[PDB]
Coordinates of C-alpha atoms and ligand atoms in Angstrom, one line a residue:
Chain A
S12 CA 114.3 97.7 103.3
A13 CA 117.6 99.0 104.5
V14 CA 119.2 96.0 102.9
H15 CA 116.8 95.7 100.0
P16 CA 114.9 99.1 99.3
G17 CA 112.0 98.8 96.9
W18 CA 111.8 95.0 97.3
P19 CA 109.4 93.2 97.3
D20 CA 107.0 95.5 95.6
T21 CA 104.7 95.8 92.5
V22 CA 105.0 98.4 89.8
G23 CA 102.1 99.9 87.9
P24 CA 99.6 99.0 86.7
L25 CA 99.6 101.0 83.5
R26 CA 97.2 100.9 80.6
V27 CA 99.1 100.9 77.4
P28 CA 98.1 99.9 73.8
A29 CA 98.7 96.2 74.5
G30 CA 96.5 96.2 77.6
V31 CA 97.2 96.4 81.3
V32 CA 100.9 96.0 82.2
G33 CA 102.6 95.7 85.5
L34 CA 105.6 94.3 87.3
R35 CA 105.5 92.0 90.3
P36 CA 108.0 89.6 92.0
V37 CA 108.9 86.2 90.5
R38 CA 107.3 83.3 92.4
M39 CA 107.3 79.5 92.4
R40 CA 104.0 79.1 90.5
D41 CA 105.5 80.9 87.4
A42 CA 107.2 77.6 86.4
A43 CA 104.6 76.6 83.8
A44 CA 104.4 80.0 82.0
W45 CA 108.1 80.6 82.2
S46 CA 108.9 77.1 80.8
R47 CA 106.3 77.3 78.0
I48 CA 107.5 80.7 76.7
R49 CA 111.3 80.0 77.1
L50 CA 110.9 76.7 75.3
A51 CA 108.8 78.2 72.5
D52 CA 111.0 81.2 72.0
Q53 CA 114.4 79.4 72.0
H54 CA 115.3 80.8 68.6
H55 CA 114.6 84.3 69.8
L56 CA 116.4 84.0 73.1
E57 CA 119.2 81.5 73.2
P58 CA 121.5 83.2 70.6
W59 CA 121.0 86.6 72.3
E60 CA 121.6 85.6 75.9
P61 CA 124.8 84.7 77.8
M62 CA 125.9 81.1 77.3
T63 CA 124.9 78.8 80.2
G64 CA 126.7 75.6 79.1
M65 CA 123.3 73.8 79.5
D66 CA 121.0 72.1 77.1
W67 CA 118.1 74.6 76.5
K68 CA 115.3 72.2 76.9
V69 CA 116.8 70.6 80.0
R70 CA 117.3 74.1 81.5
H71 CA 113.8 75.2 80.8
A72 CA 111.8 72.2 82.0
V73 CA 109.1 73.2 84.5
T74 CA 111.0 71.3 87.2
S75 CA 114.0 73.7 86.7
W76 CA 112.2 76.8 87.8
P77 CA 112.1 76.3 91.6
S78 CA 115.9 76.5 92.0
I79 CA 116.2 79.4 89.7
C80 CA 113.3 81.3 91.4
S81 CA 114.8 80.6 94.8
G82 CA 118.2 81.9 93.6
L83 CA 116.7 85.1 92.3
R84 CA 114.7 85.7 95.4
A85 CA 117.8 85.0 97.5
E86 CA 119.8 87.7 95.6
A87 CA 116.9 90.1 96.1
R88 CA 116.9 89.4 99.9
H89 CA 120.5 90.6 99.8
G90 CA 119.6 93.7 97.8
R91 CA 121.6 92.7 94.8
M92 CA 118.8 92.0 92.4
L93 CA 115.1 92.9 91.8
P94 CA 113.6 90.0 89.8
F95 CA 110.3 91.1 88.3
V96 CA 107.8 89.4 86.1
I97 CA 106.2 91.4 83.3
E98 CA 102.4 90.9 83.4
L99 CA 100.0 91.6 80.6
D100 CA 96.4 91.5 81.8
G101 CA 97.6 89.6 84.8
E102 CA 99.5 86.9 82.8
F103 CA 103.2 86.2 83.0
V104 CA 104.6 87.4 79.6
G105 CA 108.3 87.8 80.5
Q106 CA 110.8 89.1 83.0
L107 CA 112.3 92.5 83.9
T108 CA 115.4 92.0 85.9
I109 CA 117.4 94.6 87.8
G110 CA 120.9 93.2 88.6
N111 CA 124.3 94.0 90.1
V112 CA 122.7 96.5 92.4
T113 CA 125.0 98.9 94.3
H114 CA 124.4 101.8 96.5
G115 CA 127.1 103.9 98.3
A116 CA 128.6 106.4 95.8
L117 CA 127.6 104.4 92.8
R118 CA 123.9 103.6 93.2
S119 CA 123.8 101.8 89.8
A120 CA 122.5 98.6 88.4
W121 CA 121.9 96.8 85.1
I122 CA 118.5 96.1 83.6
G123 CA 117.5 93.1 81.4
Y124 CA 114.2 92.1 79.9
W125 CA 112.5 89.6 77.6
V126 CA 108.9 89.4 76.4
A127 CA 107.0 86.4 74.9
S128 CA 107.0 86.7 71.1
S129 CA 103.4 85.4 71.0
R130 CA 102.2 88.7 72.5
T131 CA 102.1 91.1 69.6
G132 CA 100.4 94.1 71.2
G133 CA 103.6 96.2 71.1
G134 CA 105.0 98.5 73.7
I135 CA 105.2 95.8 76.4
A136 CA 109.0 95.8 76.6
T137 CA 109.2 99.6 76.6
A138 CA 106.5 99.8 79.4
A139 CA 108.4 97.3 81.4
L140 CA 111.6 99.2 81.1
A141 CA 109.9 102.5 81.9
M142 CA 108.3 101.0 85.0
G143 CA 111.6 99.5 86.0
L144 CA 113.4 102.8 85.6
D145 CA 110.8 104.7 87.6
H146 CA 110.9 102.2 90.4
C147 CA 114.7 102.1 90.5
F148 CA 115.0 105.9 90.6
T149 CA 112.4 106.2 93.4
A150 CA 111.9 103.2 95.7
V151 CA 115.3 101.6 95.1
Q152 CA 117.0 105.0 95.6
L153 CA 119.3 104.4 92.6
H154 CA 121.0 107.0 90.5
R155 CA 121.8 105.1 87.3
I156 CA 120.6 102.1 85.2
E157 CA 122.6 100.6 82.4
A158 CA 122.1 97.8 79.9
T159 CA 124.2 95.8 77.5
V160 CA 123.1 94.9 74.0
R161 CA 124.8 93.5 70.9
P162 CA 125.2 95.9 68.0
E163 CA 123.5 93.3 65.9
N164 CA 120.4 93.2 68.1
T165 CA 118.4 95.8 66.2
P166 CA 115.1 95.3 67.9
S167 CA 116.5 95.6 71.4
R168 CA 118.6 98.7 70.6
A169 CA 115.4 100.3 69.3
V170 CA 113.5 99.4 72.5
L171 CA 116.3 100.8 74.8
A172 CA 116.7 103.9 72.7
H173 CA 113.0 104.6 72.7
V174 CA 112.7 104.9 76.4
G175 CA 115.8 107.2 76.7
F176 CA 118.9 105.1 77.1
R177 CA 122.1 106.7 75.8
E178 CA 124.9 104.8 74.1
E179 CA 128.0 105.2 76.4
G180 CA 130.5 102.8 74.9
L181 CA 131.4 99.6 73.1
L182 CA 132.5 96.7 75.3
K183 CA 134.8 94.5 73.3
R184 CA 134.5 90.7 73.6
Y185 CA 132.3 91.3 76.6
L186 CA 130.0 88.3 77.0
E187 CA 130.1 84.7 75.8
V188 CA 127.0 84.7 73.5
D189 CA 126.2 82.3 70.6
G190 CA 129.6 80.5 70.7
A191 CA 132.0 83.5 71.0
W192 CA 133.0 86.5 73.1
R193 CA 130.8 89.2 71.6
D194 CA 131.0 93.0 71.6
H195 CA 128.2 94.7 73.5
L196 CA 127.1 98.3 73.4
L197 CA 126.8 99.8 76.9
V198 CA 123.7 102.1 77.3
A199 CA 122.6 104.0 80.3
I200 CA 120.3 106.6 81.8
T201 CA 120.6 108.5 85.1
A202 CA 118.0 109.8 87.5
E203 CA 118.5 113.5 86.5
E204 CA 117.3 112.5 83.0
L205 CA 114.1 110.7 84.0
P206 CA 111.7 113.6 84.3
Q207 CA 112.3 114.7 80.7
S208 CA 112.6 111.2 79.3
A209 CA 110.3 109.2 77.1
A210 CA 110.2 106.6 79.9
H211 CA 108.6 109.2 82.2
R212 CA 106.1 110.2 79.5
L213 CA 105.2 106.5 79.0
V214 CA 104.6 105.9 82.7
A215 CA 102.6 109.1 83.2
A216 CA 100.4 108.5 80.2
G217 CA 100.0 104.8 81.3
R218 CA 98.9 105.8 84.7
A219 CA 96.5 108.5 83.4
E220 CA 94.9 106.0 81.0
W221 CA 94.6 103.3 83.7
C222 CA 93.0 105.8 86.1
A223 CA 90.3 106.8 83.6
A224 CA 86.9 105.6 84.8
Chain B
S12 CA 87.6 111.4 92.7
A13 CA 84.9 113.6 94.3
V14 CA 82.3 111.5 92.4
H15 CA 83.9 108.1 92.7
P16 CA 86.4 108.0 95.6
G17 CA 88.6 104.9 95.7
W18 CA 87.8 104.1 92.0
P19 CA 89.5 102.9 90.0
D20 CA 92.1 101.2 92.2
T21 CA 93.6 97.9 93.1
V22 CA 93.6 96.2 96.5
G23 CA 96.3 94.0 97.9
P24 CA 98.2 92.0 97.0
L25 CA 98.1 89.6 99.9
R26 CA 99.7 86.3 100.4
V27 CA 97.2 83.9 102.0
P28 CA 97.1 80.1 102.2
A29 CA 95.6 79.8 98.7
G30 CA 98.3 82.0 97.1
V31 CA 98.6 85.6 96.1
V32 CA 95.2 87.3 96.1
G33 CA 94.3 90.8 95.0
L34 CA 91.4 92.9 93.7
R35 CA 91.5 94.9 90.5
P36 CA 88.9 96.5 88.2
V37 CA 86.8 94.5 85.8
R38 CA 87.9 94.9 82.2
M39 CA 86.9 93.8 78.7
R40 CA 89.6 91.2 78.4
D41 CA 88.0 89.3 81.2
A42 CA 85.3 88.0 78.8
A43 CA 86.9 84.6 78.1
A44 CA 87.6 83.7 81.8
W45 CA 84.3 85.1 83.1
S46 CA 82.3 83.2 80.5
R47 CA 84.3 80.0 80.8
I48 CA 83.9 79.9 84.6
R49 CA 80.3 81.2 84.9
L50 CA 79.2 78.6 82.3
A51 CA 81.1 75.7 84.0
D52 CA 79.7 76.8 87.4
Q53 CA 76.1 77.3 86.3
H54 CA 74.7 74.8 88.8
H55 CA 76.8 76.1 91.7
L56 CA 75.8 79.7 91.0
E57 CA 72.3 79.7 89.6
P58 CA 70.4 78.5 92.8
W59 CA 71.7 81.7 94.5
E60 CA 71.7 84.2 91.7
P61 CA 69.2 87.0 91.2
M62 CA 67.2 86.1 88.0
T63 CA 68.0 87.9 84.7
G64 CA 65.1 86.7 82.7
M65 CA 67.2 84.9 80.2
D66 CA 68.9 81.6 79.7
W67 CA 72.1 81.1 81.7
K68 CA 74.1 80.2 78.6
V69 CA 72.9 83.3 76.7
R70 CA 73.7 85.6 79.6
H71 CA 77.2 84.2 80.1
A72 CA 78.3 83.8 76.5
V73 CA 81.6 85.5 75.8
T74 CA 79.9 88.1 73.6
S75 CA 77.6 89.1 76.5
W76 CA 80.5 90.5 78.6
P77 CA 81.2 93.8 76.9
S78 CA 77.7 95.2 77.7
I79 CA 77.9 93.9 81.2
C80 CA 81.4 95.2 81.8
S81 CA 80.5 98.6 80.3
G82 CA 77.4 98.8 82.5
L83 CA 79.5 98.0 85.6
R84 CA 82.1 100.5 84.7
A85 CA 79.5 103.2 84.0
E86 CA 78.0 102.8 87.4
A87 CA 81.5 103.0 88.9
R88 CA 82.1 106.2 87.0
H89 CA 79.0 107.6 88.7
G90 CA 80.3 106.4 92.1
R91 CA 77.5 103.9 92.6
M92 CA 79.5 100.7 92.3
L93 CA 83.1 99.4 92.5
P94 CA 83.2 96.2 90.4
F95 CA 86.4 94.2 91.1
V96 CA 87.8 90.9 89.9
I97 CA 89.3 88.6 92.4
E98 CA 92.8 87.4 91.2
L99 CA 94.6 84.3 92.4
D100 CA 98.2 84.4 91.2
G101 CA 97.1 87.0 88.6
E102 CA 94.2 84.9 87.3
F103 CA 90.6 85.8 87.2
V104 CA 88.9 83.5 89.8
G105 CA 85.7 85.5 90.6
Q106 CA 84.3 88.9 91.4
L107 CA 84.0 91.2 94.4
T108 CA 81.4 93.9 93.8
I109 CA 80.5 96.9 95.9
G110 CA 77.1 98.3 95.0
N111 CA 74.4 100.8 95.9
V112 CA 77.1 103.2 97.2
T113 CA 75.9 106.2 99.0
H114 CA 77.7 109.0 100.9
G115 CA 76.1 111.9 102.8
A116 CA 74.7 110.8 106.2
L117 CA 74.5 107.2 105.2
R118 CA 77.9 106.2 103.7
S119 CA 76.8 102.7 103.1
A120 CA 77.0 100.1 100.3
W121 CA 76.4 96.4 99.8
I122 CA 79.1 93.9 98.9
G123 CA 78.7 90.7 96.9
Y124 CA 81.1 88.0 95.7
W125 CA 81.6 84.8 93.9
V126 CA 84.6 82.4 93.5
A127 CA 85.2 79.7 91.0
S128 CA 83.9 76.4 92.4
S129 CA 87.2 74.5 92.0
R130 CA 88.8 77.2 94.2
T131 CA 86.2 77.5 97.0
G132 CA 86.8 76.7 100.7
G133 CA 90.4 77.9 100.6
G134 CA 90.2 81.5 102.0
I135 CA 89.8 83.3 98.7
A136 CA 86.4 84.7 99.4
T137 CA 87.2 85.7 103.0
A138 CA 90.3 87.5 101.7
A139 CA 88.4 89.2 99.0
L140 CA 85.7 90.4 101.4
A141 CA 88.4 91.6 103.9
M142 CA 90.2 93.5 101.2
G143 CA 86.8 95.0 100.1
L144 CA 86.0 96.1 103.6
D145 CA 89.4 97.7 104.1
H146 CA 89.1 99.6 100.8
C147 CA 85.5 100.7 101.5
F148 CA 86.3 101.9 105.0
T149 CA 89.4 103.9 103.9
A150 CA 89.5 105.0 100.2
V151 CA 85.8 105.0 99.5
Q152 CA 85.2 106.8 102.8
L153 CA 82.2 104.6 103.8
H154 CA 80.8 103.9 107.2
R155 CA 78.9 100.7 106.7
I156 CA 78.9 97.7 104.4
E157 CA 76.1 95.2 104.2
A158 CA 75.4 91.9 102.4
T159 CA 72.4 89.7 101.7
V160 CA 72.5 85.9 101.7
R161 CA 69.8 83.2 101.7
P162 CA 69.4 81.3 105.0
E163 CA 69.9 78.1 103.0
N164 CA 73.3 79.3 101.7
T165 CA 75.3 77.7 104.5
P166 CA 78.8 78.2 103.0
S167 CA 78.2 81.9 102.2
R168 CA 76.8 82.6 105.7
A169 CA 80.0 81.0 107.1
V170 CA 82.3 83.1 104.9
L171 CA 80.5 86.3 105.9
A172 CA 80.4 85.5 109.6
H173 CA 84.1 84.6 109.5
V174 CA 85.3 88.1 108.5
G175 CA 83.0 89.9 111.0
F176 CA 79.6 90.5 109.5
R177 CA 76.7 90.6 112.0
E178 CA 73.1 89.4 111.3
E179 CA 70.8 92.4 111.3
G180 CA 67.6 91.0 109.9
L181 CA 65.6 88.7 107.6
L182 CA 64.3 90.3 104.4
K183 CA 61.1 88.5 103.4
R184 CA 60.7 87.5 99.7
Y185 CA 63.6 89.9 99.0
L186 CA 65.2 88.8 95.7
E187 CA 63.9 86.9 92.7
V188 CA 66.1 83.8 92.8
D189 CA 65.6 80.3 91.4
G190 CA 62.1 80.8 90.3
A191 CA 60.5 82.6 93.3
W192 CA 60.9 85.6 95.6
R193 CA 63.3 84.3 98.3
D194 CA 64.0 85.4 101.9
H195 CA 67.5 86.8 102.4
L196 CA 69.3 87.5 105.7
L197 CA 70.8 91.0 105.9
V198 CA 74.3 91.1 107.5
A199 CA 76.4 94.2 108.1
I200 CA 79.6 95.7 109.6
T201 CA 80.4 99.3 110.3
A202 CA 83.8 101.1 110.3
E203 CA 84.0 101.3 114.1
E204 CA 84.2 97.5 114.1
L205 CA 87.0 97.1 111.6
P206 CA 90.1 97.3 113.9
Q207 CA 88.9 94.4 116.1
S208 CA 87.6 92.4 113.2
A209 CA 88.8 89.1 111.7
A210 CA 88.8 91.0 108.4
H211 CA 91.4 93.5 109.6
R212 CA 93.6 90.6 111.0
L213 CA 93.4 88.8 107.7
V214 CA 94.5 91.7 105.6
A215 CA 97.3 92.7 108.1
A216 CA 98.6 89.1 108.1
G217 CA 98.2 88.9 104.3
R218 CA 100.2 92.0 103.8
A219 CA 102.9 91.0 106.2
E220 CA 103.2 87.6 104.5
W221 CA 103.4 89.1 101.0
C222 CA 106.2 91.5 102.1
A223 CA 108.4 88.7 103.3
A224 CA 111.4 88.7 101.0
Ligands
LIG317 CL1 102.8 89.4 93.6
LIG318 CL1 94.1 96.4 86.6
LIG319 CL1 86.8 81.5 101.6

C-alpha cells in the first residue's frame, strides 16, 4: 500500500469489440494457459523478447511457471512491478507487466505486453495498455510510463502509438534480442497527457459499453 | 441506476479455499460453458429444477443460450433480476441469480444458485451466496433476501443454513419440479442480520485473503 500502491488490484472490466477485457494479478494456476500460449507463439515472441539464455520449450513447460509467478509476485510485494494477466471473457490471453517502478521525484515505470495470436478480435493489446496506463496514473500514483520497442516491430509500434505513446528517443544497442544488441525506440506518455489521450477515450468508451444494461 | 441499482456490476473477487471466486453478469459468450456443464450435470440438476416443458437436451443446447441470456438481461434492465455467473479462477462454474426484485416498502428478492457438480462441496456456493447477499444489501439497496429449497435437498439446505438463512415456512406444492408440484422450504435473511452473519465473515475473510500480496 505504502510500499506497493495499486497492488494487488483488478482493472476494468471493459467491453471492447473483442469482448470483455480486464487485468488481474498473475497466479499459480495460470501455468497451463501461459505454457500453451507461449509455446504456440514461440515464433511471434522469442525473436522480439530479451534473450534468456534458455531453451524456449524448457523455459515454458507448465512446471516452470511457479518459480516465475513467485518471482513476479515477490517484486510486486516490494512495489517494483505490477504483473497483470490480460483476460478476454475471463480467460488468460496474455500479460501486461509494469516494471522498474520508482516513486520519489521520478514516479516512472516501463510497460510491456503480449497477447495470444489465436485471439483475433483486435484491440485487446490497446485495451490492456490503456487500462494499465489509467491504473498507473491513478492507483499507483505514477507520473510517467515508458516502453521500448524495436524499430522493426511494426505491429507493436502501431499499438503503442495508437493509445498515445510518444517517441522520445532511439536507444542504441540497447537489449540483447535475437542474437545481437538491438536498437530500441523509447516511447513514453505522462499523466498530464492521459485525459486527452486515445487511451482515456478507449477506457471511457469501454466502461460505458460494459455498463450498458 | 434508478431503475436497476447495482446492475450491471461485478462482486468480489475473493480468495477462498477453492480458489479465486467472483460474480459477474451473464453474457452471450457463456453459451458453450453453460451448455456443456448443464448437459453434463442433467441428472444432478433436473431433480431440483423448475420444469420448462421441454427436453433437457433441447433446453440446454448451445443455441438455446442467446434467448435465455437476452431474457435475463432484459429483466435486469427493468430492475427485476440480477443474473450473475459464478467464476472460479475466471471460469464459468455456475450461476447466482437474484430475482423478483422489489423496492418500495418491501425491498426484497429471491436468490438462487447452482454450481458445476465436479466443483461442489468446496465453498463455491457459500461464497457466491455471501457475495450475493453483500451486494443485495448494499448496492441493490434491499432489505431482505429469500430462497426456496426442497426439504429433500439436503446439500442445498446445508449451504443456505451455513451462510445465515433462517427457515421461515413450508410452501406446499410450490413449484413444478420433477413431474409434480413439490413442497419447498422458504428461508430468508434480512439486512439487520448481515453484520453478525457467517456470510459477512466469509466475504470479509475472502477479501482480506485476496488482498494479501
Ligand atoms: Cl484475481
Ligand atoms: Cl463481466
Ligand atoms: Cl459450497
